[PDB]
Amino acid sequence: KVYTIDEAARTAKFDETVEVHAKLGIDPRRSDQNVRGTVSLPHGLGKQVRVLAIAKGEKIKEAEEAGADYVGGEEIIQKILDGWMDFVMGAVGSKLGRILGPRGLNPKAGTVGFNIGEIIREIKAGRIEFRNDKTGAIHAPVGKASFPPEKLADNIRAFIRALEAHKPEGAKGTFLRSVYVTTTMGPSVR
Amino acid sequence: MKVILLEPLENLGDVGQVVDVKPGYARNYLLPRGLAVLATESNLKALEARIRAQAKRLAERKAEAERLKEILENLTLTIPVRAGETKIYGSVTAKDIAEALSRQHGVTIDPKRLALEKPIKELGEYVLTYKPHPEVPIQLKVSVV
Amino acid sequence: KVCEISGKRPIVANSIQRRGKAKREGGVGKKTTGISKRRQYPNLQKVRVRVAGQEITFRVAASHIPKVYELVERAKGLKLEGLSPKEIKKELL
RNA sequence: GGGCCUGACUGCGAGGCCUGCAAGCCGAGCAGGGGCGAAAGCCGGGCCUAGUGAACCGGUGGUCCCGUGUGGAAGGGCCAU
RNA sequence: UGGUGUUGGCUCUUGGUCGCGCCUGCGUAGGAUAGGUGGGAGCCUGUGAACCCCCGCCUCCGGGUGGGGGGGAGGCGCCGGUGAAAUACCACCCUGGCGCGGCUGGGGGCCUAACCCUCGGAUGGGGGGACAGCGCUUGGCGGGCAGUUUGACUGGGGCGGU
RNA sequence: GUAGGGAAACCGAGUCCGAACAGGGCGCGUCCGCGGCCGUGGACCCGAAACCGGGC
RNA sequence: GGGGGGAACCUGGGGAACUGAAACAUCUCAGUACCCAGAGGAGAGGAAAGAGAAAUCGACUCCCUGAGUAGCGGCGAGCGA
RNA sequence: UGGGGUAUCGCCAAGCGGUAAGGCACCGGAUUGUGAUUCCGGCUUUCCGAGGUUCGAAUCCUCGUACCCCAGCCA
Ligand SMILES: [Mg+2]
Ligand SMILES: [Mg+2]
Numbered sequence: 001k002v003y004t005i006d007e008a009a010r011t012a013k014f015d016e017t018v019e020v021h022a023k024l025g026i027d028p029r030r031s032d033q034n035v036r037g038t039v040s041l042p043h044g045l046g047k048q049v050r051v052l053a054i055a056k057g058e059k060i061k062e063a064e065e066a067g068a069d070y071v072g073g074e075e076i077i078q079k080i081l082d083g084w085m086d087f088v089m090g091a092v093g094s095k096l097g098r099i100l101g102p103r104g105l106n107p108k109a110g111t112v113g114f115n116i117g118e119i120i121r122e123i124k125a126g127r128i129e130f131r132n133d134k135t136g137a138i139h140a141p142v143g144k145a146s147f148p149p150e151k152l153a154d155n156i157r158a159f160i161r162a163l164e165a166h167k168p169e170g171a172k173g174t175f176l177r178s179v180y181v182t183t184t185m186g187p188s189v190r
Numbered sequence: 191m192k193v194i195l196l197e198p199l200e201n202l203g204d205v206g207q208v209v210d211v212k213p214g215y216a217r218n219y220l221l222p223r224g225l226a227v228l229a230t231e232s233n234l235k236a237l238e239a240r241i242r243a244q245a246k247r248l249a250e251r252k253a254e255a256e257r258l259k260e261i262l263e264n265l266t267l268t269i270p271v272r273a274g275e276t277k278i279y280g281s282v283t284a285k286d287i288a289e290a291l292s293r294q295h296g297v298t299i300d301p302k303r304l305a306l307e308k309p310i311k312e313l314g315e316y317v318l319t320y321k322p323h324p325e326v327p328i329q330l331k332v333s334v335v
Numbered sequence: 336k337v338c339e340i341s342g343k344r345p346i347v348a349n350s351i352q353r354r355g356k357a358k359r360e361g362g363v364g365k366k367t368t369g370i371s372k373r374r375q376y377p378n379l380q381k382v383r384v385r386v387a388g389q390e391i392t393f394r395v396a397a398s399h400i401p402k403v404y405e406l407v408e409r410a411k412g413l414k415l416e417g418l419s420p421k422e423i424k425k426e427l428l
Numbered sequence: 429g430g431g432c433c434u435g436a437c438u439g440c441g442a443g444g445c446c447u448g449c450a451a452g453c454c455g456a457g458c459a460g461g462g463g464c465g466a467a468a469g470c471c472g473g474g475c476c477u478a479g480u481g482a483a484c485c486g487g488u489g490g491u492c493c494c495g496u497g498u499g500g501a502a503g504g505g506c507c508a509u
Numbered sequence: 510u511g512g513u514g515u516u517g518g519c520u521c522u523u524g525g526u527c528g529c530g531c532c533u534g535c536g537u538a539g540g541a542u543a544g545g546u547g548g549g550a551g552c553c554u555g556u557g558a559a560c561c562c563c564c565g566c567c568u569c570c571g572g573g574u575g576g577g578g579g580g581g582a583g584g585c586g587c588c589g590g591u592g593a594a595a596u597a598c599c600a601c602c603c604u605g606g607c608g609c610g611g612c613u614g615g616g617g618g619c620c621u622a623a624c625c626c627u628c629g630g631a632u633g634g635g636g637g638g639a640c641a642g643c644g645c646u647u648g649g650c651g652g653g654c655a656g657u658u659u660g661a662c663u664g665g666g667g668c669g670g671u
Numbered sequence: 672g673u674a675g676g677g678a679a680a681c682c683g684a685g686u687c688c689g690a691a692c693a694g695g696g697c698g699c700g701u702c703c704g705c706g707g708c709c710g711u712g713g714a715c716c717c718g719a720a721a722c723c724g725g726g727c
Numbered sequence: 728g729g730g731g732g733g734a735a736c737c738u739g740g741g742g743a744a745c746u747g748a749a750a751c752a753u754c755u756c757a758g759u760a761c762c763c764a765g766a767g768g769a770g771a772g773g774a775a776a777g778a779g780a781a782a783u784c785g786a787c788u789c790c791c792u793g794a795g796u797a798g799c800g801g802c803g804a805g806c807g808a
Numbered sequence: 809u810g811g812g813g814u815a816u817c818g819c820c821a822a823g824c825g826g827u828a829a830g831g832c833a834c835c836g837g838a839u840u841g842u843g844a845u846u847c848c849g850g851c852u853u854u855c856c857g858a859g860g861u862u863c864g865a866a867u868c869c870u871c872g873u874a875c876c877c878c879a880g881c882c883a
């Protein structure tokens with residue numbers, strides 16, 4: 001109705017339950033879909049981002065304050081991975097497929113990081129505010145939404161998750177969505 | 191097919207109303223059995239006739255009632271009865287009241303649906319009614335001398 | 336026969352016998368094995384209709400059938416009588 | 429028999445074998461981009477003559493082209509098969 | 510011979526579709542019958558809850574859901590732990606399911622009033638009856654008829670061979 | 672008839688295929704009369720068996 | 728007021744085959760011959776819901792040209808604005 | 809020319825996302841004048857095979873192969 005009536009976000013623990021759930025052309029022929037790594041979200045809504053800088057135990061000095069909080073190294077690899085009660089990520093660039101600590105042994109490990117000479121930069125951002133949600137064979141969509149406090153400035157997924165319309169390889173109609181969890185679910189076009 | 195009904199019908203109807211049915215039913219049941227008639231342009235603006243040639247006729251009776259209820263729902267009259275204290279010896283059948291109005295003030299009465307029931311016969315004042323639709327509960331004083 | 340209202344009547348026509356695959360599909364063209372004349376009829380029917388005091392029927396096609404039950408109307412304001420169903424129908428336009 | 433290869437080419441073709449027509453056939457060389465050879469050179473399939481079928485009708489790729497008032501289409505044409 | 514027209518009422522009856530609503534999903538560990546994936550640290554009870562009884566359906570015979578009565582202030586998740594997947598509860602959507610619903614269909618009963626048969630002449634009464642019949646349309650069985658084809662060489666023609 | 676190549680768009684003594692400015696393929700009357708031959712028509716002249724229409 | 732008749736001409740409603748294709752079915756002969764009906768000295772058709780590309784025309788009918796063009800075509804014979 | 813269907817133990821063939829079910833075939837064994845039918849046990853496993861899906865797939869999606877049907881044209 002009208003547009004993105006954020007008002008529907010109108011009831012409990014800080015309103016950060018609203019979603020973006022939708023649905024579309026099931027994994028056709030061979031290809032498919034998968035949202036992007038760290039979708040910025042023109043709000044950010046400072047979430048508990050755990051950019052575990054799998055660096056060489058040195059990018060824990062400027063990766064702790066540049067878009068996250070805590071960081072590890074090549075020790076969560078075979079020293080804190082030997083046990084399953086102490087172990088996100090950004091693989092080592094160049095020729096270092098860190099497939100010896102995060103692969104299978106069912107979580108995050110798809111996109112890496114950039115800044116070999118320091119775990120930050122002179123304008124640190126784009127590493128602490130959101131994430132993703134690939135393609136679940138049956139029911140896809142399901143993206144992260146904002147929080148209650150803003151008007152025509154809260155609908156940050158209406159622009160974000162929206163234009164994410166960049167996977168359409170060759171399918172059908174990608175409609176059937178809405179927003180909100182731990183609440184309800186409204187109806188607004190796109 | 192659109193068609194105007196007459197004598198109502200279980201399944202659909204009620205004089206005037208317009209429902210539509212398969213040509214067949216129409217042409218072989220309703221139209222020949224004088225049940226309903228075609229819903230032509232002709233008899234169309236025509237149903238308008240009786241729809242308003244009664245709607246505006248009924249409004250007349252309703253308009254000669256409420257127009258004798260603001261000019262005769264407020265008059266109480268005074269009756270020239272004879273007796274002494276309790277009971278009389280001349281009740282006051284409707285008409286009587288009327289001869290004490292149609293000619294005592296000037297109002298033709300319909301001496302029945304006036305709300306008077308069993309003949310009076312006793313001194314005092316009363317209230318009655320009249321008409322079928324919005325009525326007119328008009329009082330009346332029974333006197334002496 | 337030939338409807339009495341619309342005046343429809345049998346038309347003549349040929350029936351084409353093609354064979355093959357239209358070139359709008361597979362192609363190669365489409366041939367014609369047999370032609371021959373025949374006629375298409377007007378789906379006329381009977382329509383008996385009260386009126387005046389008599390009956391009088393109609394050789395009309397289901398197409399102009401409504402038109403019949405439509406005359407019976409515009410003549411309610413007429414003086415149709417005399418033991419003349421044959422004349423009733425006549426003047427019934 | 430072995431090593432590198434794909435000239436089992438694209439543009440073309442002076443000149444002739446054959447010969448009713450239509451076909452069938454041989455061809456030096458020039459230009460393009462190549463292969464093998466040090467080089468001269470050779471390579472436009474097969475030692476060689478049988479292994480086949482005009483047009484019409486269609487199908488698939490291509491493409492400069494035409495496009496029913498104009499724009500775009502439909503449908504056609506040209507090259508290839 | 511399907512479809513449609515002339516063709517109309519009434520009830521029962523199943524599909525197929527989309528709406529929506531509630532269920533649905535029992536490998537091995539795990540408080541057990543865990544559907545994917547996302548959010549999520551707090552929700553649910555007087556917008557009257559745990560044991561209990563009555564009652565409907567599913568059954569992997571253990572376990573599952575809804576309705577009502579008694580009753581009266583508790584429950585269940587984060588946790589933990591386990592497992593590849595964790596958890597309340599809020600969504601969006603798969604497999605099969607039913608339930609009312611729109612739009613379509615398939616069949617089955619019964620009716621009269623089209624149509625058809627008929628009845629000492631009938632504005633009718635009986636019988637068939639929405640079928641037949643007839644129009645347009647679909648695919649077929651079809652020497653009953655109809656137009657035509659059935660090559661050349663060839664020690665004559667066919668037969669044989671080419 | 673004084674323009675021709677090209678499927679065409681199109682250019683023009685050129686032009687078409689072509690990556691080419693290699694080659695190569697195609698590049699200058701009419702109006703009457705008379706005569707021969709040709710075409711469409713019964714087309715030198717007779718001649719079928721037969722087919723079809725409407726009638727007797 | 729009609730009915731019936733009239734050499735040819737006219738229009739409407741139906742409508743072959745020989746033949747051609749060097750056999751034969753689409754095709755051609757042909758909407759011709761011929762059956763029937765109506766009309767008249769003619770009949771037909773006639774004042775745009777048209778032509779077609781022209782900033783256009785401006786009933787119909789008929790003759791010449793357009794042109795055997797455009798196109799039609801077992802793209803055959805051949806048919807034709 | 810479209811679109812289906814399959815092909816798995818040796819013969820034909822069942823066939824849910826967690827697993828290879830049967831009869832028959834042959835083999836051992838009991839009974840058999842002899843002899844079918846019997847009655848047990850096995851016998852046999854890249855499930856066509858190359859990718860991706862998935863925590864794993866005979867069992868589900870693409871692709872390639874063989875053969876089986878349907879339907880369909882044939883200048
Ligand atoms: Mg043809
Ligand atoms: Mg109609």
Ligand SMILES: [Mg+2]
Nearest residue numbers: 430431432433
């Ligand atoms: Mg060699």
Ligand SMILES: [Mg+2]
Nearest residue numbers: 446447449451
């Ligand atoms: Mg020659």
Ligand SMILES: [Mg+2]
Nearest residue numbers: 455456457472
């Ligand atoms: Mg050479």
Ligand SMILES: [Mg+2]
Nearest residue numbers: 463464465466
């Ligand atoms: Mg070299």
Ligand SMILES: [Mg+2]
Nearest residue numbers: 465466467469
């Ligand atoms: Mg050299």
Ligand SMILES: [Mg+2]
Nearest residue numbers: 473474475476
């Ligand atoms: Mg050799």
Ligand SMILES: [Mg+2]
Nearest residue numbers: 485486504505
């Ligand atoms: Mg062609």
Ligand SMILES: [Mg+2]
Nearest residue numbers: 362487488504
């Ligand atoms: Mg084509």
Ligand SMILES: [Mg+2]
Nearest residue numbers: 495496497498
């Ligand atoms: Mg046009």
Ligand SMILES: [Mg+2]
Nearest residue numbers: 495496497498
């Ligand atoms: Mg145009």
Ligand SMILES: [Mg+2]
Nearest residue numbers: 535536537538
């Ligand atoms: Mg167990």
Ligand SMILES: [Mg+2]
Nearest residue numbers: 537538539592
């Ligand atoms: Mg376990």
Ligand SMILES: [Mg+2]
Nearest residue numbers: 619620637638
């Ligand atoms: Mg019955």
Ligand SMILES: [Mg+2]
Nearest residue numbers: 621635636638
């Ligand atoms: Mg009856």
Ligand SMILES: [Mg+2]
Nearest residue numbers: 627631633634
């Ligand atoms: Mg009867």
Ligand SMILES: [Mg+2]
Nearest residue numbers: 639640641642
């Ligand atoms: Mg019938």
